[PDB]
Symmetry: D2
Subunit: 187 residues, 4 copies
């Protein structure tokens, strides 16, 4: 059974990005032998988050869940042409090679189609600094296009990305350290 974890990073209440991540998580769980959880970074204790204080139980639990996942859905609104500081603050407290062995799906929403590349030029390299095994294609949605609630063209692309993410998940322990530059030195 796979463990899928979504991480969504809008600091805004009523996040469209969170709804997109939730849609993706449900889509995957409906089609694979998986359980999941959704870490809303806004709901973590701000002081403990920024300080990396793992004596805070809920923060520690989020970090552990991320490290134990087979696949991560990583979702952010575009802020200042990149991922949010809130999301990055969470990523910052994971272990150096936290994503070894894991598949990943980058998702974003933005106000303008002009910032589609923020995922591939911005978030993708950060995931790769963490030894990630397989990051599939990024999907970006313009705020308006949202409202299974979007134009058919956009919906196909989204569903295809989530399909690929699900297909990329690994059920073999032989893959658990892949992506790490020195697998024997753990993951």
């Amino acid at each position: 059974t796979y463990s899928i974890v979504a991480i969504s990073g809008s600091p805004s209440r009523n996040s469209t990005t969170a709804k997109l991540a939730e849609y993706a998580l449900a889509h995957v769980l409906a089609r694979s032998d998986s359980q999941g959880r959704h870490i809303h970074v806004i709901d973590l204790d701000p002081k403990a988050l920024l300080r990396g204080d793992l004596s805070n139980a809920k923060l520690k639990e989020a970090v552990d869940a991320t490290c134990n996942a087979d696949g991560l859905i990583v979702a952010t609104p575009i802020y200042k042409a990149s991922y949010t500081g809130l999301l990055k603050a969470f990523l910052d407290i994971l272990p150096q090679f936290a994503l070894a062995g894991k598949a990943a799906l980058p998702l974003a929403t933005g106000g303008s189609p002009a910032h589609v590349l923020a995922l591939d030029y911005g978030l993708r390299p950060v995931l790769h600094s963490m030894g990630v095994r397989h990051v599939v294609q990024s999907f970006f949605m313009v705020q308006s296009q949202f409202s299974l609630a979007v134009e058919d063209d956009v919906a196909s692309q989204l569903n295809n990305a989530i399909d690929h993410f699900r297909l990329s998940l690994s059920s073999e322990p032989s893959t658990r350290h892949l992506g790490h530059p020195r697998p024997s030195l753990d993951a």
Copy 2:
């Protein structure tokens, strides 16, 4: 008289990055008609910061000081091959075109020379999303090289960067909106 603001973004106590930003701020003030301040992002209220709550006086003051600056020194340790979430969280609460008219100097420290490009590929585009007028060359220092406390080669490069930053400062009101895509629509 110029207003220079340094912003340093390590979540760590006893920050080498903060010391580097402080050195740069002093260097500039010693050689120009300038006053300055140093915003240590770690010292802002974490909840108000992540929420963009400007009813918090100290946070509001930091934002106002940044908006009123003629030059910004923007300093971060390299975390996960990019700037810190803590720094980006601060940038996230500035107005859309907050940096219109302003000069800027990107500084970082890291554990490895392998991540020198995180400034130019990572931070530089974010500053440009904010209508920044002139971002001079980046300077990156490897943690060890630190201890006016470094190898002569490194010191020359650092001092040259800070020199250029100082020279790039503008004393003319005609430049106040430069960098903004629609100057008449403010800055």
Copy 3:
């Protein structure tokens, strides 16, 4: 008197990107004491270009003109989410710190607004590897928007970028090495 050089990098005949670069060059020359030239990379000898063979007079002349410029207009269509190989091939043959002292204006056209960031995440860091003094804001135009031939909103942004580029030009020899990490070691 300033020397302005435009470099345009579409491998396609009848380049919209070339027309945009030509517009920008004319705009600058109409408003400053400047002379200019427009290097169309497609018109350089392909073998000599890819080999960096400076025994080819026309290639050598282009390189010399670039090195002697006070400002460069650097224009590319977006190919595969970045600048063209053709443009980069030209940049590759310039000296290591070829752009020391120089102002620069990044321009592009693309088929989709989705790749606006290719300039700031892609081309901007390359210019900074060359000791460039001041790169002003990027301007990107979607192919359709073209036809002083565009929507008023787009035209304002373009003209503002070119205005800023012109204003950023330096008439003082004291600036000739600025941007170089070791000015005394030339430029």
Copy 4:
């Protein structure tokens, strides 16, 4: 049986980058049921390459071989903090979604460890613009470290990257369009 294609993009004769790509290609072929070829971009006809002239047989053959590959090894020296114009010129002539279904391994050599990130921030996004299925970790080598001819630490990392690349290859036709945003619209 897998088809593996290496593409190496140094414009320099006696390329260390080419030797690294050749090592990687041999490593993969020694451990999987694979045949391979090595496209040295410098050996393609410069005029036909820059013009995308597929009436040139050798260029057409290279493009076809790339499109027919199950895995690509993509190798470049670092020039001006990014991949070479020569390499990008080749990538530019591939079909829009040329890499659909394919695994990929990014390799580089450079003069300085300071540009390690050029692969992940520079080349990786370009491969993803082409619908690539799985790009494993990047490997970068400093020119000196070269001479199975390097320090044990570096050799382990290289071999691990090539191992992962080989393991990522797919023998199932069900994967042939994965990575493409609209699989039914081909690849």
